[PDB]
Structure to design on (919 residues):
RNA sequence: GAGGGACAAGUGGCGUUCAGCCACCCGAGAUUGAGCAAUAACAGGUCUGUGAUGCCCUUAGAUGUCCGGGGCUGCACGCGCGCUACACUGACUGGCUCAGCGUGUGCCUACCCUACGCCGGCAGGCGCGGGUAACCCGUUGAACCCCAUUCGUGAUGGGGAUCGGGGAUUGCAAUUAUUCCCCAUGAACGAGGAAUUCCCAGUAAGUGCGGGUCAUAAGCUUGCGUUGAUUAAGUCCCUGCCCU
């Protein structure tokens, strides 16, 4: 029937914002170019700053971890802690 | 490392549109497929669960649709299916997205001819399993 | 024989740059415990709560809102991530900038009602230093919670961001936002 | 507009419609031995150094 | 051969236990101790009222069942001699050979 | 040196013991667990494909801990929170066919001895196997 | 919360009126002296009476 | 030369059998390094990380706990170690060093030697908890 | 089981010799929670608790008492006590690990608690054993929590309402209500205006267990455990009450 609610707060963050499932060619190439420039390598910063989902972000961070460019400090439940040497 | 595969939007059974998050959770979008049936069909198709919907072979898509339309040739015993013995035919089958609503309409159409009060409460604005409807069922 | 240390830390030479908050922050050597999860019995006497360490107070105020009410192991884990994130962000030790953030977390005076049984005017009066510490920790944990509400960022990540942006006056943290919201009303009702 | 510091000598009593403020005759460090009475809300003892934002006011009651 | 002494209240329990000790420790019998059992409690909660008026005020009735056991290895003729005791009525005696 | 499974962390021990049971082939899996079998009373299936070997390793560790458990005892050892939805949760028990399956499989592979009072207990062959596997997991830990 | 009853204070006043040489400044001795010179059923009442007896002894011996 | 010291957490009792040896801590057959919460792997080591290693390698203590909760068992093991050292330094080592190490333990933390009388209160017949009541109904 | 142990006692200050408040040590505790609970009322409720009862009504086609059904649940709405969510401090899977009250059979008149082994995917069935109980379930291997994987801010895998099909359990019978299990359908809900309830330390809250109901039986309630804070120790402004 009718639709009623007591609060009036519309206009959320960004209009059902999209996020890339799979990495592109030039986008992931730019990611590999500017990825040593960050001081703290965390999956949330890599996901939200660089328009990456969490799954692809963790996959790319584990791939670069196996490559050895980024050192692991202490991994845990959900706060994965990486650091670049020097 | 699978850079890019040109596959975003799929068309399954002429009505359903597959998503892009996974494959075992994009088969969830098909009506007649919920939580466990998709992970059963994935294990019958032997697909690695990390793979997306767009990173998957079209021949393997046809194999998954073959397992959808006929699961009883290989495995998946008679209890796991949705459409059990009460068919008017006795055929143990799994419903489709176009088939599920048609079977529900046939259920309601024969219940209106039976004139059971279950069908009567579904025809009225009532609840079948509504043991209390004082506060429950407003607007 | 060795010095008392939180993780691989030292817990030493953390000097408070001003007065009016000494002997209520337990950063000193006689209150340096290894984990914040201790036997909390600091609510029987009126002034035994000030001897609690501020990291334990931060965990205790971080655990809130029913679904997370309790779970000291979880919130000590969150603070263990947060100190590490603050250290990896350009050094600048997390205990030192935690004390600096408690100093710079806003209210040095607040407005409240006076008597006379007449027109409510809310005259701005002075505030207790204990209440400054309490409101500091409460505003920092509330800002961290609503910053890490509905995002990929974690409670510890937004708590580290809140402590850094509260120790540095960049006007981007919830402590500085409510410092604006309270000190403008306090100067208006002065 | 200076900002001064002050440590508590004595505690007079409690004041308010709730009784929440406390009349504290604090003292003055940076100048000579002057005496005003301010209102502090929250728990307080004697000897607590306190940041003042205005030293010209004097809230007195009899 | 054991004897179970189960009483209603702990005062008469300890009195009949002290009487059994005073009547048993003079003979040539290695008397085992009056082994203390944990106290049983039957908790019954009651509405206190025949009709529903007022706050939820509940009676909480409890008992305190106290049980003791003694062990006396002997021929069966000695046990019947020990059993004959002018006893408090709130004490129950069981024997097991 | 003397290595006991309590001296070694389990979170490496079961993860290696699944592979060392895959190397031996100590698993029976007749038809329904070949097809699909769900959890206690849940919605989804377990993820990591060697979960039958993981159940067998957990059963082996529990029979090393306590001697005399059985089907219902190990079913209560698994334990369950039954999220009923709107109605609140309760303690639900696990499945019984896997609880008899793993015991029958380890009996056929000579790792479960019958107790005349209860159920499973450790065999000397299973004792030697678990002790050597704990020793090599402790060697991988110290290396 | 030491605002003990008139019966407690009056019993202690009867004690300090009748027997003064038997009492001292030690609680552990005065509690035992009161159980020889009076009959008190309750152990908390023993402690209360003996504490007020020690307070009366500290008042009388000083002033 | 063997002293058993007991527990006394809220509902956690730790039997700590202490005896002269070469350095061992047994918690139900499981050593000191395996603490069941990973977060509390500094609090139970507070008798270890503060008092030294020549004391650890001098005193063997085996601990068996039948407690009620995880945190309660951790503090029961902590209090049982901190009291088993006091009992062994009463029964074998002189008081001139026992008083020094007891002053060190007391000036570190009171809860090492002093048990805390805190138990959960009885739930009342009026409300859902010990102090809380149910919601009223006015107009 | 008894006895001991805590009394504002030792010190200093605040106080009229005072009654008494504040800070510390020794101590396990500087005092925890309940039951009983004055004179006197409410013209509060119970005749539907009684073979406790006065008065009035019916008494053989019965307002007595049996048998078969329906009803108390029935919904265009409003209100109260509650349960579950609105997620990332989170959901899924796997491994790991800890309780305490209390209950349980052949009953003053019909009756359980459950170990083990087998079958079945599951709820369940079959055979046998123990327990009238610190003996057996049961060293109540509980939930929460800890570690690892998956999801990635999408009304999403959060929420599981509504609804269709099938299978078992108790009952003589669950259909216009059982209950549980399996699949499937997948709504509102984006942290809630005006107002309002409870609470000062193992306390609120999260979370599970036992009993009462029962034959099958909790979201109610009574008690128990696990994890376990932020704030006060102050006043008469809002409300209620007591005294002159
Ligand atoms: Mg319908
Ligand atoms: Mg109604
Ligand atoms: Mg009366
Ligand atoms: Mg009669
Ligand atoms: Mg409700
Ligand atoms: Mg409910
Ligand atoms: Mg019966
Ligand atoms: Mg339905
Ligand atoms: Mg019944």
């Amino acid at each position: 029937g009718k639709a009623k609610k007591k609060k009036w707060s519309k206009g959320k963050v960004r209009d059902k914002l999209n996020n890339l499932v799979l990495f592109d060619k030039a986008t992931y190439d730019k990611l590999c170019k500017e990825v040593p420039n960050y001081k703290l390598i965390t999956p949330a910063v890599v996901s939200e700053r660089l328009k990456i989902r969490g799954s692809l972000a963790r996959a790319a961070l584990q791939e670069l971890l196996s490559k050895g460019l980024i050192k692991l400090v202490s991994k845990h439940r959900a706060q994965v802690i990486y650091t670049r040497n020097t | 490392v699978i850079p890019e595969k040109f596959q975003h939007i799929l068309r399954v059974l002429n009505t359903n549109i597959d998503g892009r998050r996974k494959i075992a959770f994009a088969i969830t979008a098909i009506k007649g497929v919920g939580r466990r049936y998709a992970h059963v069909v994935l294990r019958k198709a032997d697909i690695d669960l990390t793979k997306r919907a767009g990173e998957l072979t079209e021949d393997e898509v046809e194999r998954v649709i073959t397992i959808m339309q006929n699961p009883r040739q290989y495995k998946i015993p008679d209890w796991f299916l949705n459409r059990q013995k009460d068919v008017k035919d006795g055929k143990y089958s799994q419903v489709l997205a176009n088939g599920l609503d048609n079977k529900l309409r046939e259920d309601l159409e024969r219940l209106k001819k039976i004139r059971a009060h279950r069908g009567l409460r579904h025809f009225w604005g009532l609840r079948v399993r509504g043991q209390h409807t004082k506060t429950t069922g407003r607007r | 024989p060795d010095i008392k240390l939180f993780g691989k830390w030292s817990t030493d030479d953390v000097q408070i740059n001003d007065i009016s908050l000494q002997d209520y922050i337990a950063v000193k050597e006689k209150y340096a415990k290894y984990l914040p999860h201790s036997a909390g019995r600091y609510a029987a006497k009126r002034f035994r709560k000030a001897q609690c360490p501020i990291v334990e107070r931060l965990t205790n105020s971080m655990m809130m809102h029913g679904r997370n009410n309790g779970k000291k192991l979880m919130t000590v884990r969150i603070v263990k991530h947060a100190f590490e994130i603050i250290h990896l962000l350009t050094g600048e030790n997390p205990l030192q900038v935690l004390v600096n953030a408690i100093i710079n977390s806003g209210p040095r005076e607040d407005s409240t009602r006076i008597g006379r049984a007449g027109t409510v005017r809310r005259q701005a009066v002075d505030v207790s230093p204990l209440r400054r510490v309490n409101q500091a920790i409460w505003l920092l944990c509330t800002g961290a919670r609503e910053a890490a509400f509905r995002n990929i960022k974690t409670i510890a990540e937004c708590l580290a961001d809140e402590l850094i942006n509260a120790a540095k006056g960049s006007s981007n943290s919830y402590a500085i936002k409510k410092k604006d919201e309270l000190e403008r009303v306090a100067k208006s009702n002065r | 507009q200076p900002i001064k510091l002050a440590r508590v000598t004595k505690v007079l009593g409690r004041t308010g419609s709730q009784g929440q403020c406390t009349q504290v005759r604090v003292e003055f460090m940076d100048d000579t031995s002057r005496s005003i009475i301010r209102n502090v809300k929250g728990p307080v003892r004697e000897g607590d150094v306190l940041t003042l934002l205005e030293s010209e006011r004097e809230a007195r009651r009899l | 051969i054991r004897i179970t002494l189960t009483s209603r209240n702990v005062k008469s329990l300890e009195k009949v236990c002290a009487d059994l000790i005073r009547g048993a420790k003079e003979k040539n019998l290695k008397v085992k101790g009056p082994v203390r059992m944990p106290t049983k409690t039957l908790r019954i909660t009651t509405r206190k009222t025949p009709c529903g008026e007022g706050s939820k005020t509940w009676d909480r009735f409890q008992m305190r069942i106290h049980k003791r056991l003694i062990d006396l290895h002997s021929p069966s003729e000695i046990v019947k001699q020990i059993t004959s005791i002018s006893i408090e009525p709130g004490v129950e005696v069981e024997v097991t050979i | 040196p003397g290595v006991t499974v309590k001296d070694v962390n389990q979170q490496e021990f079961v993860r290696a013991l699944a592979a060392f049971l895959k190397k031996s082939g100590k698993l029976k899996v007749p038809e329904w667990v070949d097809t699909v079998k769900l959890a206690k009373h849940k919605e989804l299936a377990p993820y990591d494909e060697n979960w039958f070997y993981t159940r067998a390793a957990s059963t082996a560790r529990h029979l090393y801990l306590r001697g005399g458990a059985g089907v219902g005892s190990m079913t209560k050892i698994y334990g369950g929170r039954q999220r009923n939805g709107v109605m609140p949760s309760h303690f639900s028990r696990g499945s019984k066919s896997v609880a008899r399956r793993v015991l029958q499989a380890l009996e056929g592979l000579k790792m479960v001895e019958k107790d005349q009072d209860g159920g499973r207990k450790l065999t000397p062959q299973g004792q030697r196997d678990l002790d050597r596997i704990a020793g090599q997991v402790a060697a991988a830990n110290k290396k | 919360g030491r605002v003990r009853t008139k019966t407690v204070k009056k019993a202690a006043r009867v004690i300090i009126e009748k027997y003064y040489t038997r009492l001292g400044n030690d609680f552990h001795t005065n509690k035992r002296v009161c159980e020889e010179i009076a009959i008190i059923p309750s152990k908390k009442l023993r402690n209360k009476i003996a504490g007020y007896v020690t307070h009366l002894m500290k008042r009388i011996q000083r002033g | 030369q063997s002293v058993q010291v007991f527990g006394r957490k809220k509902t956690a009792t730790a039997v700590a059998h202490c005896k002269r040896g070469n350095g061992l801590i047994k918690v139900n057959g499981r050593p000191l390094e395996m603490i069941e919460p990973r977060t509390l792997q500094y609090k139970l080591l507070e008798p270890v990380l503060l008092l030294g290693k020549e004391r650890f390698a001098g005193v063997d203590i085996r601990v068996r706990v039948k407690g009620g909760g995880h945190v309660a068992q951790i503090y029961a093991i902590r209090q049982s170690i901190s009291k088993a050292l006091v009992a062994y330094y009463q029964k074998y080592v002189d008081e001139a060093s026992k008083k020094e190490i007891k002053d060190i333990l007391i000036q570190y933390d009171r809860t090492l030697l002093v048990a805390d009388p805190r138990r959960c209160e009885s739930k009342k017949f009026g409300g859902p908890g010990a102090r809380a009541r149910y919601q009223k109904s006015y107009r």
